[PDB]
């Protein structure tokens, strides 16, 4: 990885030392990038829905995963799993359990700096991964694309700067989430977003992360290219707030 600082540097020790997973998954790989592009020709609103307990904000929620998870597969285009334990009190198990029970496309949300990191997601039934270019060098962002790609999975990576955007346009990405929150302050900057945005491709599938809570923004960001939402916590407490959000 690189020079990290604070929680990112952190996560990514726990990361390193992180027991591998040695199962076999149970169903194919469903692509949430296709699936995406696929909501879009039929003019469906495509949200991800997270499936997140902790994060740094000081987010804490618990709620019944299965029952979460039945319910967005109603609604959602895919599903977000943090997997990550001290910091998003994720778990490989429920990741497991809930990816055993539902037919959407999973992505598996960690801080992934190790091949066996994306065996796991394979092996536990995760259809893809994010990929976080903060945490990653040029190369190991190659080296891991590839390898997820290896096994049918097109990964998400995510942005949040200027800077990881060269980067994620130098590495061949083709699916790209464009972070709402700075990863030491948890700073929303919409204007930044939105520029970050406006500089990808439009052959690259779009995921505008979080800061979004109204229809209206839904609107506005499809009008500027983003191809599905991916929604924070504000529905890890009211899960039928996505109804309104996709019409
Ligand atoms: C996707 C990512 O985990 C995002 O949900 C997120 C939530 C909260 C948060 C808080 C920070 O500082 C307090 C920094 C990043 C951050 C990201």
Redesign the pocket.
Known sequence: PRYLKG?LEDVVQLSLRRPSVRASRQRPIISLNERILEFNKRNITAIIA?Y?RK?????DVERDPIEYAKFMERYAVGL?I?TEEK??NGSYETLRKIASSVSIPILM?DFIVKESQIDDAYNLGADTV?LIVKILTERELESLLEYARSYGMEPLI?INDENDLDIALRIGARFI?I?????????INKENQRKLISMIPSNVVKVA??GISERNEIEELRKLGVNAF?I??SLMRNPEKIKELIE
């Open positions: 929680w997270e997140k994060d740094p904000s000081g987010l977000f943090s910091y998003f949300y994010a995510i989430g972070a709402a929150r700075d990863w030491e302050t948890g700073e992360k979080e991916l924070g916590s």
